[PDB]
C-alpha cells in the first residue's frame, strides 16, 4: 500500500511514459544524486 | 525512440525542470529504493 511507503519514510514519484510508481529510498536518492565516483554514498 | 524503451521492458519517468526524460530501470529502481546498506542487490 502507498501509505506504507510514506509511513516508512520513502517518497514516491509518478512514472508517466509506461509503468506505475517507483519509490525513492534514502540511499538511492544519494546514489541517484552523484556526479562522479566521489559523490555517491560510501556503501556503493 | 521512446517505444524502444518500453519494448525493452523499461519504464521511464518525465523530468519537470531540465531533463525531459529519465529512463528508470528495475535494478536501478530496486537500488534506488533503499534506506541503508541492507537493501541493495548482491551485485552492489
Amino acid at each position: 500500500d502507498v501509505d506504507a511507503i510514506l509511513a516508512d519514510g520513502k517518497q514516491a514519484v509518478a512514472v508517466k511514459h509506461g509503468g506505475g510508481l517507483v519509490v525513492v529510498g534514502e540511499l538511492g536518492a544519494q546514489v541517484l544524486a552523484a556526479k562522479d565516483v566521489s559523490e555517491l554514498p560510501d556503501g556503493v | 525512440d521512446v517505444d524502444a524503451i518500453l519494448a525493452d521492458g523499461k519504464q521511464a519517468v518525465a523530468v519537470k525542470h531540465g531533463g525531459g526524460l529519465v529512463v528508470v530501470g528495475e535494478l536501478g529502481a530496486q537500488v534506488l529504493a533503499a534506506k541503508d546498506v541492507s537493501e541493495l542487490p548482491d551485485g552492489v
Binding site: 501509505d3 509518478a14 506505475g20 517507483v22 | -
Partner: protein
C-alpha cells in the same frame, strides 16, 4: 472472402481478460490485469480488492480484452439425369412430376 469475422468483448472481471495493463495498490506493475480474477473464493479476493488511500495516484490499473469469432461457408449440390427413352415408354405418364 467466404469468411465472417466477429468481435466478442469479455467482461472485465473474467479470467479471459488477460492484459499487461496491470498496476497494484503499491504502484508496481502486476501480471494479472483482470484484478481480483474470476475466482469466487473469499480466501484471496479480499487481498486483491482495489484498496485506495487518501493519497491517490497511479494505483489499481486495469485493462480490457476482446475476442474474435470466425465463421465459414461451404458449397453443396447434387443432380440426376434421365434418358428420353425412359419417360416416353414408361408405364406412368407423370414420372417427370
Amino acid at each position: 472472402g467466404k469468411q465472417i469475422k466477429l468481435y466478442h468483448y469479455v467482461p472485465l472481471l473474467d479470467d479471459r481478460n488477460v492484459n499487461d495493463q496491470g498496476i497494484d495498490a503499491a504502484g508496481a506493475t502486476i501480471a494479472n490485469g483482470n484484478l481480483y480474477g474470476s475466482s469466487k473464493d473469499i480466501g484471496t479476493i479480499p487481498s486483491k480488492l482495489p484498496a485506495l488511500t487518501e493519497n491517490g495516484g497511479r494505483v489499481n490499473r486495469v485493462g480490457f480484452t476482446r475476442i474474435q469469432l470466425i465463421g465459414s461457408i461451404k458449397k453443396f449440390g447434387f443432380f440426376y439425369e434421365w434418358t428420353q427413352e425412359a419417360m416416353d415408354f414408361d408405364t406412368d405418364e407423370e414420372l417427370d412430376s
